Design a protein around this ligand. Structure first.
Ligand SMILES: [Cl-]
Ligand SMILES: [Cl-]
Ligand SMILES: [Cl-]
Ligand SMILES: [Cl-]
Ligand SMILES: [Cl-]
Ligand SMILES: [Cl-]
Lengths: 127, 127, 128, 128
């Protein structure tokens, strides 16, 4: 049964596993009566989610919208109200911390003295 | 046995699987006699590799350098000559096409008429 | 991009487990629906060659192509009908036959590098 | 960041299969080596709760901590010695017991959405 608490839990559990997006999309479409609150929760949770989890939220929106069309235009219309905000948020958050693995790599190298501090500084500056 | 052809093949097969980097690092360290050509091939192949494959090449360099230290300083020294170039290349390539999934998403939405052209244009502009 | 079996092989070798990668390739395959026969044939050839951890994405791609091809014509539904059961069967067998592969590859790393003594590896190995 | 079992649980829940994620968490655990006992205890508790596809990363993290902890002291080598065999055994059992999970989840999607008739699903299902 649908509950906003059940949704927060499934969104929190939304992983990188290939089945994750489509499995959740099936449950969301079964509960299309609640399309408005679903999108409201999705939007709130997309903003709260970490930089690396955000892009999977848009994949979820894409799968839900595309597959909901054969059932009703409610998901298409509900998502339409938040998508400009959603895309602009993910696009700037993608930019801010795109080199996060590179920054993390140099931090590991510094802390584990993989190279000397001067060489670390050259690598940092090269970014 | 080591061959630059055997290396190109293993680098080409270097995937996202958790074991991929450390498994290849074991073979590269066994063949540390060839550290110079290994790094030369790695560097050439890192540049030829696609944007999404490039970061795994640096993870490979990190694992090789860290683990080679108990055997000899050759990998540390050989990598030192190319790392400023390697990091600067990955850091700009990360930036150029960070929003590649977002750009690809909008292209799917346009082509599959998920939303009308005017709404697609708003989403594009929001990036 | 103009259709060719070589272009398709390169696209399948670069296919990743991401939704945007499956769906971007799916757009190109449906644009080239005139070649559904050769497309399905190459897809199946490349699926069998593919690494155990890459096989599942091929099935996600087939489903995305079939579902989205319907509004364009019956070509892909028809072409995949004859191979999808065998394609799924292959993935079913290979997933069982290569299930222990990540733990075996992990153990291989630990046999070579772990600082715990020899009996520890045997204990891990026995657990499997 | 100051050490706490709650901070560690949050860090483990955000731990990804990427090298930079395993190694960044590993830096923090070795900095907090004074708490090796409680760290290993939480790690093991969180590994068992973790989704089948997330379990393997915990083992990569344990190995990175043990290898890099040595130059700092014997705390982590000592603490992981007593649990790593059981931790590995759990992953060995769960990988076999949940091997067919991705194909089963794929079939679940196709049962709900596929445009091929009912007999097709049964044929896929029989292949497993
Ligand atoms: Cl509710
Ligand atoms: Cl549905
Ligand atoms: Cl050679
Ligand atoms: Cl080694
Ligand atoms: Cl299409
Ligand atoms: Cl450390």
């Amino acid at each position: 049964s649908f509950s906003e608490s059940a949704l927060e839990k499934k969104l929190s559990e939304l992983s990188n596993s290939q089945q994750s997006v489509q499995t959740l999309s099936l449950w969301l479409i079964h509960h299309r009566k609640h399309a408005g609150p679903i999108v409201s929760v999705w939007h709130r949770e997309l903003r709260k989610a970490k930089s690396n989890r955000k892009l999977t939220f848009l994949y979820l929106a894409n799968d839900v919208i595309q597959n909901s069309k054969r059932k009703g235009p409610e998901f298409t219309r509900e998502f339409e109200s938040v998508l400009v905000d959603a895309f602009s948020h993910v696009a700037r958050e993608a930019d801010e911390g795109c080199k996060k693995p590179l920054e993390r790599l140099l931090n590991i190298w510094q802390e584990r003295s993989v190279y000397g501090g001067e060489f670390i500084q050259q690598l940092k500056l090269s970014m």
